[PDB]
Amino acid sequence: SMGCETTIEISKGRTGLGLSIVGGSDTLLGAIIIHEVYEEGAACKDGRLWAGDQILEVNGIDLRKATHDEAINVLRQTPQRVRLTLYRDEAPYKSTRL
Numbered sequence: 001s002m003g004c005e006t007t008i009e010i011s012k013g014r015t016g017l018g019l020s021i022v023g024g025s026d027t028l029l030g031a032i033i034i035h036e037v038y039e040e041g042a043a044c045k046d047g048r049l050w051a052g053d054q055i056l057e058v059n060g061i062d063l064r065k066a067t068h069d070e071a072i073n074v075l076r077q078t079p080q081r082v083r084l085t086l087y088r089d090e091a092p093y094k095s096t097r098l
């Protein structure tokens with residue numbers, strides 16, 4: 001009913017952040033969303049990031065209205081320590097293989 005914001009700093013590993021991203025202002029989501037947190041990646045080991053979280057900002061760069069490609073460029077260009085500001089909607093983010 002009320003969602004919640006957090007800011008966390010993730011130190012990258014060999015595989016980077018360890019996540020995949022979907023969405024963008026150019027999409028049905030209208031936001032940059034974390035689709036998956038990969039096992040054994042940096043974001044998993046940190047424990048705090050969840051699929052479905054929205055990336056609002058990265059190291060002082062606003063991604064609230066970014067297109068998918070704008071966001072990837074931003075994320076690609078980040079340093080070793082990535083300060084992410086996230087919004088967690090109460091909605092679940094569901095993913096099923098069949």
Ligand code: NA
Nearest residue numbers: 032055063064
């Ligand atoms: Na966003």
